[PDB]
RNA sequence: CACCAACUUCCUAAACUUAAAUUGGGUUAAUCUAUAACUUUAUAGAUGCAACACUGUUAGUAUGAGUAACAAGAAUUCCAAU
């Protein structure tokens, strides 16, 4: 057990100078001991990464997976504790900066078998962490153009040196 | 030089905005209530002369920001980015509303304004391009028409198909840039200074100032381009997805000064049209449509 | 360990020998105990050797700070800013004297694999070989099979 | 058949993070014009649909009380009337279901 | 729970590295750290360079205006090095200019000034200053010392050296340290010229020489995406210089660069600067 | 290998498939709006309409009466089918039933659902889809084209 | 832990009978004012003056003053403003450094939770500009035994609150604002170690609205189930 | 009419001449005790004194694998219901 994602929500930064850029807000929320697999939960967490909170609260609602409702709840708690206790002006000015699922404490039980034999069953739990950062979703990755691809090849050749000699 | 004209107008626009903002000291909270069907009864406390209808959408959800084009302040259409002034009621109008009359006109004027910007900067510096006005035509007209006067040296030259294609590429470039429209209310005295060179613009400014009891005028800036606006416009250029300058027709009764009517079509991202439907509408726009 | 470690090229601090040679060792600090068997060898070093070393190298500020201590420690500061500390626990005067002389002679440069034994800023005097060297030209510069 | 070697996390991370195994994003989500809740384009709005079904249950409950038996379905046409409404001449000879509440806006 | 205190102690230091290295503290001037006496370190600085110094004069050089103001405010809640800085900079500029002119008299005055400014720039001066321990002994209100303040102290040291030992010894210090940096560096890295071909024509006219003729000496894979061309400028059918380039224009432009060096004698095969003269 | 096989495979076999549809149909013929998994509701839709065809034939026809018995488990609904459902649909020749897809089930089974009804029912109207009005931007432009073409025609 | 136990006894079920505390809890202050002095309309217009009015009102508070003499014998109405002034300025300064220990001594147990609770994970910059007018003692009341003293304070102040991230909410970086308020100072007459501290501030109805917060706020609308409808 | 080729040999600095059961020798990691030292050290006295390997023992966690396998007749007016 180690609950550090809970403490990070309490960090206090020093006041800014009159012309410093306005620091974007960060929120740290999670839920523990969820009756779900961490491997199954990752697909839901991976999906929402890099999206807004009104664009991640829509994709989740129409997913059949059980975890979709669980994540949606902690994406609404995060969306409320940001506006009330972290000074976020607009509900629609957030985006999921990070989101991942972690292993929890499990329980060991006996799964019976057919010849007086058995195997060890584990009832699986997990945790799920999310960070929300105030600001529109960073623009997506732009694929390298053909010109950019060609430039790297030339740059690679330009770096060539005469090896193993003065 | 035309570059000088843009700079001075731009500077004048900035000064007018700066005084208006400086003119308003402190923050005074104003009550505005949501009157729309869905999410009814919400009440926003906003900053007077600073808050915008876009901010009201931001509180509610991202859907309103993405799908809202105009807002009805106390039964009057107001630009989404135009700052609020006093306590009122706010209703957001999407394209797909049952009564989109106001939305259609806002989009209509908007597209023809972007058309005007393309034309002036499309020509070569050697020739002279002056913008007279665009007549208000019903959407049923089948295209939006901007009238542009041209230098006498061009009276014998009519743009070819390649020239028409070039304009759309510039228009699409403006759309891709995604430049928000800037909404400013300007008194006639300042407005005349910004457009003193253009006699037709001066005359249009006089008409607008005369209509209202005061000398208030509506000025819209699309990036560098600055022009008077008949009505509230779309918040952003990216709202347009399909764009096309159908054709340009010389006005027959233009003995004193030759004027060419520049007619085009555009459809927003919301109401996209299939390829076949787009072509038929494009063909209709090529027909010259008069103003009733 | 070569692939498992960093490397660099042969280098100096400020072109040490181009003009005047400047001693790189800047400061040596030695902490000792009045009553401790381990620091006995170092106590002999301070009695006799330290005075000779200080005069021989007058660009090395030497600090001796006897304190109640368990391990005698020598800290070497170079001009480039690099620090180096070596434990002198239970070392005789002969070992310390030899050890200190290594510190004075070395420079602050990192002790890691040196890629090349030599360094030159002007390796070529007659011009670096390029493919067109030793290639004869043709009248009017006609490339092979060009009719002109 | 049993594994001949343990499979490394790198190989496992290649199989379970493949594009074929990820959740494909949905592009058909919209906003219901009336209530504003989210809906898929080819599907009805649950929020609006729930109102209709809730009214349907109340109407059906009222019908059950009147009939009072399993095999009591009336051949004649059914009709539902709300408070403040009286049957018209064209509605004569039609079973009437009485509801205390006012006529809902969606109901016509 | 095993026996002993030592295993914990070795690990406590392991914890020390983890915390310090992951979250390093802000830099602190060497004065605040242990084993610091100002006078002794100042003496070693002169001895290290082998130059006898006036200790009182050297002390004033390290003093800065910013440090004095901060100290006075703290006292409420000792002479600056400005004069030395003016003398140090003035002599260094004259000394640097004199050295370059003798070595390259043909080089235009504009070229010499750029080299003098470069060798007296913050990047060159600060890098040498830091490695000479000037910053450690420097007295400045704000640490790490800002480059403009550190550059001032370096010139202040030269001014102090000049007064104590005279011009001849001060001249050696500039050569020994400042002039060395230009080793390896070619002229056009230190001095930036964007119109070499245009300047080449001007120089040839000054020499009463006709304008050059550019011709394609060698060609390689022109149509490909990796073409090499050798462009050589010809005067009176004589090759003044040659240049390699990716394109003819770049080869032509570079070929001008080669010629300008020739005229100014900055070809890398020039006689190496004589840093080793006893006098 | 099931090309042209219109029927589905439901229940425990062929006969069971017929008996599950008889229950949804009887519920529909009784309530006029019934819910089921999209697959099973769609399977019945063909059977639901054909009852009206037999109902249109009339009470006197022996075949219609016999069929209306096998396909109506409760026997208080045959009088209703013939005397209210059939008269309603006499004008129409098709499209007796309206089928729409209700969101997926919130049961942990998460099965696709649909609501099937009989047109003209007394129950509250379903939230049907609405096409955009003729006044909308795209719609208005087309109308202008229609007018122009109509004049040209 | 009790937090874990509270969940246990709610899930498991339990009869938790409350108990009569063997040792009574100790109260160093009592929430509220025994007799709140209704502020007089036009107190700002008096730009002596109130002090004369206080003399007429002193007869109402004369009984309370006598009780203070019996247990203190050093309390002076004339000299209290200066002492009270010291407490007010000193207390608000602690906020700057968030010195909880200093506040506890200066303010009462009733006052402390109000000032500090809403300023957790928040930096508050507060200074004292020159006071516009001298402070006077408005009214004093003693009930039990607790004695409460009300002091009129009109002083110019500067306050600027910041978020966790250092962004500015409320107040102004540095601008003098004139504030008139009534502060209640009380001491425990019985306790030997008691002292006068800041308990509560009386707010008048004629007080002007305070500075509005910078950020805009949405007052949400009713949340309605499918059954319900808006009106 | 030769070149390349292995620490063979030479050369700057050094070194002093050949798989493994067994056999001789010099040191060292950890801890306790004596006497000290006092950021973790010294000389002695001691011993449950050092583990990449016994299908070793205990605990924890992987892989196979989110795989094999597991379960609730329908509609409604609906879970002590028709
Ligand atoms: Mg068994
Ligand atoms: Mg297992
Ligand atoms: Mg098939
Ligand atoms: Mg099929
Ligand atoms: Mg050998
Ligand atoms: Mg052992
Ligand atoms: Mg082991
Ligand atoms: Mg083992
Ligand atoms: Mg596994
Ligand atoms: Mg498998
Ligand atoms: Mg299976
Ligand atoms: Zn809806």
UniProtKB/Swiss-Prot annotation, chain A:
The keyword DNA repair does not apply. The keyword Nucleotide-binding does not apply. One of its GO terms (biological process) is mitochondrial translation. It is found in: Mitochondrion. GO terms for cellular component: mitochondrial inner membrane; mitochondrial large ribosomal subunit; mitochondrion. GO terms for molecular function: structural constituent of ribosome. Keywords: Mitochondrion, Ribonucleoprotein, Ribosomal protein, Transit peptide. Component of the mitochondrial ribosome large subunit (39S) which comprises a 16S rRNA and about 50 distinct proteins. Belongs to the universal ribosomal protein uL22 family. This is Large ribosomal subunit protein uL22m.
Curated annotation (Swiss-Prot), chain B:
Keywords: Acetylation, Mitochondrion, Ribonucleoprotein, Ribosomal protein. InterPro entries: Beta-grasp_dom_sf (IPR012675), Pro-tRNA_synthetase (IPR050062), TGS (IPR004095), TGS-like (IPR012676), Thr/Ala-tRNA-synth_IIc_edit (IPR018163). Gene3D superfamilies: 3.10.20.30, Threonyl-trna Synthetase, Chain A, domain 2. The keyword Ribonucleoprotein applies. Residues 28-94 form the TGS domain. The keyword Ribosomal protein applies. PROSITE patterns: TGS. Transmembrane segments: none annotated. One of its GO terms (biological process) is translation. It is found in: Mitochondrion. One of its GO terms (cellular component) is mitochondrial large ribosomal subunit. The modification N6-acetyllysine is found at residue 91. GO terms for molecular function: nucleotide binding; structural constituent of ribosome. Its main location: mitochondrion. Component of the mitochondrial ribosome large subunit (39S) which comprises a 16S rRNA and about 50 distinct proteins. Belongs to the mitochondrion-specific ribosomal protein mL39 family. This is Large ribosomal subunit protein mL39.
UniProtKB/Swiss-Prot annotation, chain D:
The keyword Translocase does not apply. This is Large ribosomal subunit protein bL32m. The keyword Ligase does not apply. It is found in: Mitochondrion. One of its GO terms (molecular function) is metal ion binding. Its main location: mitochondrion. Component of the mitochondrial ribosome large subunit (39S) which comprises a 16S rRNA and about 50 distinct proteins. Component of the mitochondrial large ribosomal subunit (mt-LSU). The mitochondrial ribosome (mitoribosome) is a large ribonucleoprotein complex responsible for the synthesis of proteins inside mitochondria. Belongs to the bacterial ribosomal protein bL32 family. Zn(2+) binds at residues 32, 35, 45, 48. Transmembrane segments: none annotated. Keywords: Metal-binding, Mitochondrion, Ribonucleoprotein, Ribosomal protein, Transit peptide, Zinc. GO terms for cellular component: cytosol; mitochondrial inner membrane; mitochondrial large ribosomal subunit; mitochondrion. It comes from the Eukaryota. MRPL32 precursor is processed by the m-AAA protease (composed of AFG3L2 and SPG7), which cleaves the N-terminal transit peptide. Cleavage by the m-AAA protease takes place prior to assembly into the large subunit, an essential step for mitochondrial ribosome (mitoribosome) assembly. Proper processing by the m-AAA protease is dependent on the zinc-binding region within the tightly folded C-terminal domain of MRPL32: zinc-dependent folding halts degradation initiated from the N-terminus and triggers the release of mature MRPL32.
Swiss-Prot record, chain F:
One of its GO terms (molecular function) is structural constituent of ribosome. One of its GO terms (cellular component) is mitochondrial large ribosomal subunit. InterPro entries: Ribosomal_bL17, Ribosomal_bL17_sf. Keywords: Mitochondrion, Ribonucleoprotein, Ribosomal protein, Transit peptide. It is found in: Mitochondrion. GO terms for biological process: mitochondrial genome maintenance; mitochondrial translation; translation. It comes from the Eukaryota. Belongs to the bacterial ribosomal protein bL17 family. Component of the mitochondrial ribosome large subunit (39S) which comprises a 16S rRNA and about 50 distinct proteins. This is Large ribosomal subunit protein bL17m. The gene is Mrpl17.
């Amino acid at each position: 057990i180690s609950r550090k994602w809970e403490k990070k929500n309490k960090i206090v930064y020093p006041p800014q100078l009159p012309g410093e850029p306005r620091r974007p807000a960060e929120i740290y929320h999670c839920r523990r001991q969820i009756k779900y697999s961490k491997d199954k939960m990752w697909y839901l967490a991976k999906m929402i990464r890099g999206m807004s909170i009104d664009q991640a609260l829509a994709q989740l609602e129409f997913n059949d997976k059980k975890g979709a409702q669980i994540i949606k709840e902690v994406l609404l708690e995060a969306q409320d504790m940001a506006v009330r206790d972290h000074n976020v002006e607009f509900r629609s000015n957030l985006h999921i900066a990070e989101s991942t699922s972690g292993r929890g404490q499990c329980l060991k039980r006996i799964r019976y078998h057919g010849r007086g034999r058995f195997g060890i069953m584990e009832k699986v739990y997990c945790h799920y962490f999310v960070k929300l950062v105030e600001g529109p979703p960073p623009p997506p990755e732009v694929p390298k153009t053909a010109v950019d691809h060609a430039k790297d090849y030339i740059q690679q050749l330009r770096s060539r040196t005469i090896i193993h000699t003065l | 030089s035309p570059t000088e004209l843009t700079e001075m107008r731009n500077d004048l626009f900035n000064r007018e905005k700066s005084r208006q903002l400086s003119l308003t000291p402190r923050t005074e909270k104003i009550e505005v209530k949501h009157v729309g069907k869905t999410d009814p009864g919400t009440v926003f406390v906003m900053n007077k002369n600073i808050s915008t209808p876009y901010s009201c959408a931001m509180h509610l959800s991202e859907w309103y920001c993405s799908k809202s084009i105009l807002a009805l302040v106390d039964g009057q259409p107001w630009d989404m980015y135009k700052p609020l002034t006093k306590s009122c009621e706010i209703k957001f109008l999407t394209f797909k509303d049952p009564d989109p009359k106001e939305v259609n006109k806002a989009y209509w004027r908007s597209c023809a304004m972007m058309l005007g910007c393309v034309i002036e900067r499309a020509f070569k510096d050697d020739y002279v391009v002056s913008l007279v006005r665009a007549p208000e035509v019903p959407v049923i007209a089948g295209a939006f028409c901007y009238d542009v006067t041209l230098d006498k040296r061009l009276d014998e030259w009519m743009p070819t198909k390649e020239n028409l294609r070039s304009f759309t590429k510039d228009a699409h470039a403006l759309i891709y840039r995604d430049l928000p429209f800037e909404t400013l209310d300007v008194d006639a005295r300042v407005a005349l200074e910004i457009f003193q060179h253009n006699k037709y613009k001066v005359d249009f400014i006089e008409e607008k100032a005369s209509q209202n009891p005061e000398r208030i005028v509506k000025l819209h800036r699309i990036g560098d381009f600055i022009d008077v606006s008949e009505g509230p416009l779309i918040p952003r250029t990216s709202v347009c997805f399909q764009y096309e300058v159908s054709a340009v027709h010389n006005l027959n009764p233009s003995q004193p000064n030759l004027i060419r009517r520049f007619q085009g079509l555009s459809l927003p991202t919301h109401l996209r049209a299939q390829f076949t439907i787009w072509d038929k509408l494009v063909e209709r726009s090529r027909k010259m449509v008069t103003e009733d | 360990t070569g692939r498992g470690t960093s490397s660099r090229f042969l280098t100096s601090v400020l072109h040490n020998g181009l003009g005047r040679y400047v001693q790189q060792l800047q400061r040596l600090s030695l902490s000792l105990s009045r009553d401790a068997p381990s620091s006995r060898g170092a106590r002999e070093f301070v009695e006799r050797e330290v005075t000779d070393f200080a005069r021989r190298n007058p660009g090395v500020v030497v600090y001796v700070n006897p304190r109640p201590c368990a391990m005698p420690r020598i800290v070497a500061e170079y001009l480039n800013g690099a620090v180096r500390e070596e434990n002198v626990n239970s070392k005789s005067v002969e070992e310390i004297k030899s050890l200190v002389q290594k510190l004075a002679d070395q420079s602050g440069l990192d002790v890691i694999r040196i890629r090349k034994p030599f360094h030159t800023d002007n390796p070529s005097i007659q011009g670096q070989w390029h493919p067109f060297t030793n290639k004869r030209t043709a009248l009017h510069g006609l490339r092979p099979r060009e009719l002109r | 058949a049993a594994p001949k070697n343990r499979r490394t996390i790198e190989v496992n991370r290649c199989r379970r993070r493949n594009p074929q195994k990820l959740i494909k994003i949905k592009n058909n989500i919209d906003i219901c014009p009336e209530c504003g809740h989210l809906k898929q384009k080819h599907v009805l709005c649950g929020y609006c649909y729930e109102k209709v079904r809730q009214e349907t249950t109340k109407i059906r409950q009222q019908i059950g009380a009147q009939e009072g038996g399993p095999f009591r379905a009336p051949s004649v046409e059914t009709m539902v009337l709300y408070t403040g409404e009286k049957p018209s001449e064209k509605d004569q000879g039609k079973r009437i279901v009485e509801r205390n509440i006012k006529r809902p806006s969606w109901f016509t | 729970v095993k026996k002993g205190f030592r295993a914990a102690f070795r690990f406590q230091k392991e914890l020390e590295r983890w915390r310090l290295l992951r979250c390093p503290p802000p830099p602190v001037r060497r004065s605040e750290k242990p084993n610091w006496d100002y006078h002794a370190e100042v003496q070693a600085f002169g001895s290290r360079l082998q130059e006898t110094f006036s200790l009182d004069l050297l002390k004033t050089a390290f003093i800065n205006s910013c440090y004095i103001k901060s100290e006075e405010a703290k006292r409420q809640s000792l002479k600056d090095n400005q004069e030395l800085f003016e003398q140090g900079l003035s002599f260094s500029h004259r000394c640097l200019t004199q050295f370059l002119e003798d070595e390259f008299p043909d080089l235009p005055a504009e070229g010499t000034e750029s080299l003098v400014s470069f060798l007296t720039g913050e990047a060159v001066v600060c890098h040498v200053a830091r490695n000479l321990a000037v910053e450690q002994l420097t007295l400045s209100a704000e640490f790490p010392v800002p480059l403009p303040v550190l550059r001032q102290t370096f010139f202040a040291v030269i001014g102090a050296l000049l007064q104590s030992s005279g011009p001849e010894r001060a001249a050696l210090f500039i050569r020994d340290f400042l002039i060395t940096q230009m080793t390896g560096k070619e002229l056009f890295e230190m001095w930036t010229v964007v119109n070499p071909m245009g300047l080449l024509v001007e120089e040839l006219k000054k020499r009463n020489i006709s304008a050059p003729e550019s011709r394609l000496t060698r060609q390689s894979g022109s149509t490909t995406a990796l073409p090499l061309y050798f462009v050589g400028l010809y005067c009176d059918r004589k090759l003044i210089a040659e240049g390699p380039g990716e394109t003819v224009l770049v080869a032509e432009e570079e070929a001008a660069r080669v010629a300008l060096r020739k005229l100014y004698g900055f070809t890398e095969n020039r006689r190496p600067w004589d840093y080793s003269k006893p006098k | 290998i099931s090309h042209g096989r219109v029927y589905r495979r439901l229940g425990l076999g062929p006969e069971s498939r017929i008996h599950l549809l008889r229950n949804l149909l009887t519920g529909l013929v009784r309530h006029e709006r019934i819910e089921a998994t999209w697959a099973r509701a769609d399977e019945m839709r063909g059977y639901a309409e054909k009852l009206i065809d037999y109902g249109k034939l009339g009470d006197t026809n022996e075949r219609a009466m016999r069929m209306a018995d096998f396909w109506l488990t409760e026997k208080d609904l045959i009088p209703k089918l013939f005397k209210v459902l059939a008269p309603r649909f006499q004008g129409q020749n098709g499209n007796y039933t309206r089928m729409l897809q209700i969101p997926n089930r919130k049961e942990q089974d998460r099965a696709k659902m649909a609501v099937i009804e009989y047109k003209g029912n007394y129950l509250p109207p379903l939230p049907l889809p609405h096409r955009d009005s003729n006044l909308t931007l795209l719609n208005q432009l087309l109308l202008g084209l229609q007018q122009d073409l109509h004049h040209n025609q | 832990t009790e937090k874990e136990f509270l969940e246990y006894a709610r899930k498991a079920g339990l009869v938790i009978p409350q108990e009569r505390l063997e040792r009574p809890i100790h109260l160093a202050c009592t929430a509220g004012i025994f007799d709140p002095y209704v502020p007089p309309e036009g107190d700002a217009r008096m730009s002596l003056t109130q002090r004369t009015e206080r003399l007429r009102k002193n007869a109402a508070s004369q009984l309370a003053i006598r009780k203070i003499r019996e247990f203190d014998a050093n309390f002076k109405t004339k000299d209290f403003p200066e002492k009270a002034k010291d407490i007010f300025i000193e207390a608000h300064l602690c906020l700057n450094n968030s010195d909880h220990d200093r506040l506890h001594t200066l303010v009462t147990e009733h006052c402390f939770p109000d000032m500090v609770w809403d300023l957790k994970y928040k930096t508050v910059r507060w200074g004292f500009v020159e006071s516009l007018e001298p402070a006077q003692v408005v009214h004093v009341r003693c009930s039990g035994m607790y004695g409460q003293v009300t002091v009129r304070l009109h002083t110019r102040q500067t306050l600027a609150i910041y978020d966790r991230f250092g962004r500015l909410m409320y107040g102004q970086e540095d601008v003098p604002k004139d504030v008139l308020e009534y502060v209640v100072f009380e001491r425990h007459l019985m306790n030997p170690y008691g002292s006068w501290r800041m308990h509560a501030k009386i707010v008048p109805a004629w007080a002007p609205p305070k500075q509005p917060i910078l950020k805009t706020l949405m007052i949400p609308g009713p949340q309605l189930k499918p059954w319900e409808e808006y009106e």
